[PDB]
Enzyme design. Structure first.
Site, PDB file in Angstrom:
ATOM      1  CG  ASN A  76     -17.572 -29.337  -5.159  1.00  9.37           C
ATOM      2  OD1 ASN A  76     -16.855 -29.546  -6.136  1.00  9.37           O
ATOM      3  ND2 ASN A  76     -17.347 -29.894  -3.974  1.00  9.37           N
ATOM      4  CB  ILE A  83     -21.561 -22.599  -4.892  1.00  7.37           C
ATOM      5  CG1 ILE A  83     -22.540 -22.369  -6.049  1.00  7.37           C
ATOM      6  CG2 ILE A  83     -20.205 -23.053  -5.428  1.00  7.37           C
ATOM      7  CD1 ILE A  83     -22.407 -21.017  -6.717  1.00  7.37           C
ATOM      8  CB  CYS A  84     -19.435 -26.623  -1.227  1.00  8.69           C
ATOM      9  SG  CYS A  84     -18.395 -26.949   0.214  1.00  8.69           S
ATOM     10  CG  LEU A  85     -15.734 -21.523  -4.483  1.00  3.07           C
ATOM     11  CD1 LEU A  85     -15.137 -22.694  -5.257  1.00  3.07           C
ATOM     12  CD2 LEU A  85     -16.313 -20.495  -5.445  1.00  3.07           C
ATOM     13  CE  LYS A  89     -17.975 -23.811   3.294  1.00  2.00           C
ATOM     14  NZ  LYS A  89     -17.791 -25.220   2.837  1.00  2.00           N
TER      15      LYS A  89
END
Lengths: 146, 138, 147
Positions: A76, A83-85, A89
């Site tokens: 992630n 950061i993919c969170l 988002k």
């Protein structure tokens, strides 16, 4: 200079969550230096991870901006530390605070989300133990205190 | 005023460029996928239709130094181009481009790319003969 | 087979400039192989740098093409070995191959980071001259050991 930002700054300094450290940059009260300890029982165990956080103009109606500065092997987190969170988002709310963001990132280190195309994420899917072995080596190289 | 730090400023521009949320005829991203400083930018501008530049893509490199966006980045063409604002080595002459000559921190990498596409339309550059399509500097 | 090229070839072979060697490639008198020694008092000292020089058809009306084959850490030389020399628009048939090689040799002694060809390398030379020269000296050791 909002009252909330000051209160959050003080709260993070006086009552920091275990394994989390956050302090603003002297030149910019909205720009934060962050350390997150590598959680126990992860490939990142013992590691010290640097991050930077920015509180944009529309905070707290919009989420803080956050990235890792310490290189990490994680499904992630990309090569630039992005950061993919969810809460960074779309799933942000003004009731959530900097504290919550840092705790989520910390939790993400213990619970990777490999079902969120990327070469790294695919490696964790196919061979978790080998991917974590790579991650453990990067931790030794990039996340030590020396 | 809210001071956006260099890193997050460049990350915002990167998010825009990567998405395709960009102006027509321009494209920009990082030269290296793991360049943590976000300094070296691999760019493309399309040639203006109805000019000598038409029907060809120009690869170019933009470098943002440690004082970006408070100071202008440097621009250099990889694809060979004959223009008033470009020297014989591909480097954009700061004085011959208005946004670089008088740089403002609100100007972006996109702004530079668009401004170069505008310079294609000028009377001095419009009919200026060009080298063969796909030539690099040597 | 022009008279000037043959004369310049002989002039470079019989009387080369100090620290500079230039010979043509067999069966191509327009192709040149160049060896330039790294100047004393520079990070490139003790090193030998390979370059290739091409003479175009219109030479000496048009300038020659030159680039390094040996990697070099220098603000005015890019990652592909290409250089930016005025005398390659400021070219005149008054100038010779010898003029170009001497100019490249002089450039190794006088780097201009404010007038850069590689902006990344240049910023390093401006922010930390000592460290940039240190990196350059290491490049010299590994990339320019012997030819």
């Amino acid at each position: 200079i909002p009252r909330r930002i000051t209160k959050e700054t003080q709260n993070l300094a006086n009552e920091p969550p275990p394994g989390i450290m956050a302090v603003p940059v002297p030149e910019n009260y909205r720009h934060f230096n962050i350390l997150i300890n590598g959680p126990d029982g992860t490939p990142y165990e013992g590691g010290t991870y640097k991050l930077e956080l920015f509180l944009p103009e529309q905070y707290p109606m919009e989420p803080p901006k956050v990235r890792f500065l310490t290189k990490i092997y994680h499904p992630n987190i990309d090569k630039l530390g992005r950061i993919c969170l969810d809460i960074l988002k779309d799933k942000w709310s003004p009731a959530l605070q900097i504290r919550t963001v840092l705790l989520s990132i910390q939790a993400l280190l213990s619970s990777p989300e490999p079902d969120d195309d990327s070469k790294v994420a695919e490696h964790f899917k196919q061979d978790k133990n080998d991917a974590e072995h790579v991650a453990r080596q990067w931790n030794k190289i990039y996340a030590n205190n020396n | 005023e809210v001071i956006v730090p260099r890193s997050f400023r460049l990350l915002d521009e990167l998010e825009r460029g990567q998405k395709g949320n960009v102006s027509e005829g321009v494209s920009f991203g990082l030269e290296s996928a793991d360049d943590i400083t976000l300094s070296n930018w691999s760019c493309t501008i399309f040639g203006q239709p109805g000019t000598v530049f038409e029907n060809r893509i120009y690869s170019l490199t933009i470098f943002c130094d440690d004082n970006y966006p408070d100071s202008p980045p440097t621009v250099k063409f990889d694809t060979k181009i004959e223009m008033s604002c470009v020297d014989n080595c591909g480097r954009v002459i700061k004085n011959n481009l208005h946004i670089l000559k008088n740089w403002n921190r609100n100007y972006t990498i996109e702004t530079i790319l668009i401004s170069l596409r505008q310079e294609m339309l000028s009377s001095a550059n419009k009919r200026l003969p060009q080298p063969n399509e796909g030539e690099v500097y040597s």
